Amino acid sequence: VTQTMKGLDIQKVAGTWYSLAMAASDISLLDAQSAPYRVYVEELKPTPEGDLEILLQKWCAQKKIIAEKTKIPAVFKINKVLVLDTDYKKYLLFCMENSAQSLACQCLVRTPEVDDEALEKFDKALKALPMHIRLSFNPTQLEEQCHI
C-alpha cells in the first residue's frame, strides 16, 4: 500500500465512525463473522501524545486497542495501520497489513448512510491492491452490533 493521507491531523478523526465497506487480500480474512479482519469500528480516540485508541466490535464483543504513532503521521503500529485518505467530516479510508502479505482495508463513514462518493474513492484505492474479498453493509446493518 503506497497511498497515505498527506498532512493528516489525527486529532480531527476523533469521534464516531461506521465500517461501511471492507476489502482484503484473502477471502478467509473477511468471509465468516469470526474472520480475523472482520472488525467493525465504533469510535476513534486520538491521545494527546498522538497515539490512536480504537473502539471496535468483533464476533459480539466490544474491544479497545491502541495504535501507537510512528515517525510518519499517517502510519500507526499494533501490524501497521495506514490512513489512505479522509475529509474528517464524512469518510476515512485506511488499511491494516502484517509482514508475510495479509492486507485488509475499510471505508469508514461518519453516519449510517451509503456514501457513493466515499465508495468510488474506496474502489479507486483498491484498484492498486490485490484484494480477493469485498463486503458492504446497508444502513439497517450499520445500526446493529457487529452489522448483523
Ligand X SMILES: CCCCOc1ccc(OCCCN2CCOCC2)cc1
Residues that bind ligand X (CB under 6 A): 39, 41, 44, 52, 54, 56, 58, 63, 65, 67, 78, 81, 83, 92, 94, 96
The CA distances from residue 129 to 2, 85, 104, 125, in Å, are 10, 15, 10, 7
Phi, psi (rounded to 5 degrees) for 70: -135, 180
Site for a copy of itself in 8-47 (CB under 8 A): 27, 31-32
Query: Taking CB within 5 to 8 Å according to partner kind, which of Cl ion, a copy of itself, ligand X, none is near residue 134?
Result: a copy of itself
Closest separation between CB of residue 26 and a copy of itself, Å? 10
Among 28, 138, 140, 145, binds Cl ion (CB under 5 A): 138
Dihedral, CA atoms, 31, 37, 42, 47, nearest 10 degrees?
-170
Alpha-carbon dihedral 40, 121, 91, 5, rounded to 10 degrees: 100
The span of 8-16, 61-69, 95-103, 131-139 binding a copy of itself (CB under 8 A) equals: 131-139
> By C-beta, is 30 or 54 nearer to a copy of itself?
30
Binding residue for a copy of itself, selected from 14, 129, 133, 146, defined by CB under 8 A: 133
Query: Across the chain, where does the E strand assignment appear?
Result: 15-16, 18-24, 40-46, 52-58, 61-69, 75-77, 80-86, 91-97, 103-109, 133-136
- Interacting residue ranges for a copy of itself, rule: CB under 8 A: 27, 31-32, 123, 131-138
